[PDB]
Amino acid sequence: LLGLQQMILSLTQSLGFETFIFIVVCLNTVILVAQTFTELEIRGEWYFMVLDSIFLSIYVLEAVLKLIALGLEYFYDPWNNLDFFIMVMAVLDFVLLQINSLSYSFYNHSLFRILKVFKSMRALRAIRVLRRLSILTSLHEVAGTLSGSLPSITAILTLMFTCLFLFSVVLRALFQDSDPKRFQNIFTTLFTLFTMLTLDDWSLIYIDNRAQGAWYIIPILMIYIVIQYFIFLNLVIAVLVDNFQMALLKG
Amino acid sequence: NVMALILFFMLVFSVFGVTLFGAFVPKHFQNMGVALYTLFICITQDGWLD
Amino acid sequence: VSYTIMHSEEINKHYFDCVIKDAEMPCFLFRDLFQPFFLVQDLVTGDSGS
């Protein structure tokens, strides 16, 4: 209606959102932790997707209520924006299942896996709206003091993103016609860079590279490994040490 | 408390994992305790190229 | 029956019978791809071919 409808919606939103949403989301999370459960889905597969679709209908009712609600201030909440994207995507997959017919591949396809991880962040949002009460103040303070120093960690991760990209570029450049069957594309090159950054069989890289005819690629790889390892690990460790050390010096 | 927070984040990100897991790339991502502990091995971050 | 059961246990890597379990008649799930295998038995002699 108007402002009067908005005020009635606010009051009844408080009441019915405290009452109805909590119990239906608790039941949704119960049926979803029974859903995932890759032993009990065969003790099922017929009472599980039914409840999944029923509570997805409950969620689209939540979305309809939030749409008829105050609106722009609802959009101003990032968690509510995540819920809005989750429900647009959810009604998209629901109508995709509903229309049937179609002309693309199905029967547990890549799109089906996409809809499964879609149900996954739906379960995550169910958890995040269940945890409205009693998160416990000790870990409240721990999480706040952890999230206090965001600019330093973002700068450090950006600098190592640049360094990892540069090292991947030079390694792919120097590995041309030198058995790149492990890093034939940009994804596999950056994943091998992830392995060397995470200390995973880079000694094996050394042994099967000196099994090849190139030997000077090993000292370059080593010096890059040690410099980026020491610099990044030490910088992050010291940054978080001090980040909680000011909170230590305070009360 | 750090143990509790790490385990809770580990579970809520394993909900993402188990959607990819079971009956495909199996025998370490299946059974939901083996999957959790294999992801814990990958958290301990040594020799996951197998 | 045995080869079909091994094929079901090797393709989808899982199997579940019905609620009313019967030895002579096994139960098949929809979600599993169905691939029968067939034997030729010669009652006059011993052999059993595929």
Curated annotation (Swiss-Prot), chain A:
Cytoplasmic side: 69-76, 134-151
Name of the gene this protein is made from: Catsper1
Knockout-associated phenotype: Mice are normal but males are sterile. Male sterility is due to defects in sperm motility unability to fertilize intact eggs. Sperm of the CatSper1 null mutant lack CatSper2 protein, while sperm of the CatSper2 null mutant, lack CatSper1 protein, suggesting that stable expression of CatSper1 protein requires CatSper2 and vice versa.
Organism: Mus musculus
Protein name: Cation channel sperm-associated protein 1
Highest taxon, organism lineage: Eukaryota
Protein function: Pore-forming subunit of the CatSper complex, a sperm-specific voltage-gated calcium channel that plays a central role in sperm cell hyperactivation. Controls calcium entry to mediate the hyperactivated motility, a step needed for sperm motility which is essential late in the preparation of sperm for fertilization.
Oligomeric form and interacting partners: Component of the CatSper complex or CatSpermasome composed of the core pore-forming members CATSPER1, CATSPER2, CATSPER3 and CATSPER4 as well as auxiliary members CATSPERB, CATSPERG2, CATSPERD, CATSPERE, CATSPERZ, C2CD6/CATSPERT, SLCO6C1, TMEM249, TMEM262 and EFCAB9. HSPA1 may be an additional auxiliary complex member. The core complex members CATSPER1, CATSPER2, CATSPER3 and CATSPER4 form a heterotetrameric channel.
Annotated family: Belongs to the cation channel sperm-associated (TC 1.A.1.19) family.
Cell compartment(s), UniProt: Cell projection, Cilium, Flagellum membrane
Intramembrane residue stretches from the record: 186-198
Coiled coil: none
Topology, Extracellular side: 38-46, 100-110, 175-185, 199-215
Tissue distribution: Testis-specific.
Chain segments annotated as transmembrane: 16-37, 47-68, 77-99, 111-133, 152-174, 216-241
Swiss-Prot record, chain B:
Expression sites by tissue: Testis-specific.
Intramembrane segments: 32-43
Gene ablation phenotype (knockout): Mice are normal but males are sterile. Male sterility is due to defects in sperm motility unability to fertilize intact eggs.
Localization per Swiss-Prot or TrEMBL: Cell projection, Cilium, Flagellum membrane
Positions in the Extracellular compartment: 22-31
Summary of subunit composition and partner proteins: Component of the CatSper complex or CatSpermasome composed of the core pore-forming members CATSPER1, CATSPER2, CATSPER3 and CATSPER4 as well as auxiliary members CATSPERB, CATSPERG2, CATSPERD, CATSPERE, CATSPERZ, C2CD6/CATSPERT, SLCO6C1, TMEM249, TMEM262 and EFCAB9. HSPA1 may be an additional auxiliary complex member. The core complex members CATSPER1, CATSPER2, CATSPER3 and CATSPER4 form a heterotetrameric channel.
Protein name: Cation channel sperm-associated protein 4
Species this protein is from: Mus musculus (Mouse)
Residues shown, of full length: 192 to 241 of 442
Swiss-Prot record, chain C:
Tissue/organ expression: Testis-specific. Specifically expressed in the principal piece of the sperm tail (at protein level). Expressed in spermatocytes and spermatids within the seminiferous tubule but not in interstitial cells.
Location(s), subcellular: Cell projection, Cilium, Flagellum membrane
Disulfide-linked positions: 18-27
Domain of life: Eukaryota
Family: Belongs to the CATSPERG family.
Further details from the record: Catsperg2 is absent in sperm from mice lacking Catsper1, suggesting that stable expression requires Catsper1.
Function: Auxiliary component of the CatSper complex, a complex involved in sperm cell hyperactivation. Sperm cell hyperactivation is needed for sperm motility which is essential late in the preparation of sperm for fertilization.
Record text on subunit structure and interactions: Component of the CatSper complex or CatSpermasome composed of the core pore-forming members CATSPER1, CATSPER2, CATSPER3 and CATSPER4 as well as auxiliary members CATSPERB, CATSPERG2, CATSPERD, CATSPERE, CATSPERZ, C2CD6/CATSPERT, SLCO6C1, TMEM249, TMEM262 and EFCAB9. HSPA1 may be an additional auxiliary complex member. The core complex members CATSPER1, CATSPER2, CATSPER3 and CATSPER4 form a heterotetrameric channel.
Record's protein name: Cation channel sperm-associated auxiliary subunit gamma 2
Lineage of origin: Eukaryota, Metazoa, Chordata, Craniata, Vertebrata
